[PDB]
Design a protein around this ligand. Structure first.
Ligand SMILES: C[N+](C)(C)[C@@H](Cc1c[nH]c(=S)[nH]1)C(=O)O
Length: 275
């Protein structure tokens, strides 16, 4: 009896796909449940609305994104990642009755990024330094980063930056910065393209960006129905360095390895999955 099947969705990129396959591998080995991974399912609002609607069951959400985008009104949080997790976990349970499991170790932040040659040429070390050259350089940003208070709106409001911005599809912005259509983009800190393309990350000197650590987000009612999901997925909690996650993103995203295979090999190596 009772092989219930779980929809596990990613945001856009190798990393949510890798994390979703990690959830699927853990759930299938350790529970009576199957999982289906939905790669590139959405951006943050679509995953969040789909999770509330029951059109998906689990996706990885990140701690500053719960506080900054999902919680309304957004709370004023410290820059300590542990405190930022507890605010995100308690807030989203209160607001929406989502259960937000314990975060992994690594942070994947938004990172205002330029070519290394561009930072050398224009004296750019911090995000404040872009105010020197905000009429000399063009940015390409993801639409959600433009849409987000901790994104380009934060670049305006906290930094006073009015960048010349083209909106980009997320899968195209790294190639645009690498080819030279743009000179600034909203990198993600564990993205393999940062090292691959010799991008240098501008320092967040006013600290616009909160901590972002990933964790499973699910409805409380699913976790009431399947309380073993908490023990099983919290295997990942406090685990996976930034350097480990970047290499997994390289394996899927750059070497074109399948995300289930990269996920399963990592968890086996890490002692978290069989064989
Ligand atoms: C991890 N992150 C860098 C903090 C972002 C990345 C992201 C936002 N939208 C999509 S798609 N990806 C997020 O998940 O909110």
């Amino acid at each position: 009896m009772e092989k219930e099947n779980l929809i596990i969705a990613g945001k856009i990129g190798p990393e949510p796909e890798i994390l979703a396959n990690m959830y699927k591998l853990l759930i299938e080995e350790n529970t009576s449940m199957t999982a289906t991974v939905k790669p590139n399912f959405g951006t943050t609002s679509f995953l969040y609305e789909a999770l509330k609607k029951g059109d998906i069951d689990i996706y990885p959400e990140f701690t500053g994104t719960v506080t900054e985008s999902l919680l309304q009104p957004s709370p004023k949080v410290s820059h300590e990642p542990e405190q930022v997790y507890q605010v995100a976990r308690d807030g989203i349970a209160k607001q929406d009755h989502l259960a937000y499991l314990k975060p992994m170790s690594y942070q994947n932040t938004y990172a205002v990024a330029v070519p290394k040659k561009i930072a050398q040429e224009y004296g750019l070390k911090t995000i404040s330094d872009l105010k020197k050259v905000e009429g000399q350089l063009k940015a390409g940003f993801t639409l959600e980063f433009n849409d987000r208070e901790d994104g380009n709106k934060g670049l305006q409001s906290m930094y006073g930056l009015n960048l010349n911005v083209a909106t980009m599809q997320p899968a195209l912005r790294y190639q645009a910065i690498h080819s030279g259509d743009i000179q600034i983009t909203d990198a993600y800190s564990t993205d393999a393209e940062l090292e691959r393309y010799d991008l240098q990350v501008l320092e967040d000197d006013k600290q616009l960006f909160p901590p972002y650590q990933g964790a499973p987000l699910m409805k409380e009612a699913l976790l009431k129905k399947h309380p073993e999901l908490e023990r099983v997925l919290n295997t990942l909690a406090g685990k996976i360095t930034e350097s480990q996650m970047s290499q997994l993103n390289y394996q899927v995203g750059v070497e074109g390895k399948s995300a289930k295979q990269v996920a399963k090999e990592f968890l086996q190596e890490q002692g978290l999955l069989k064989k």
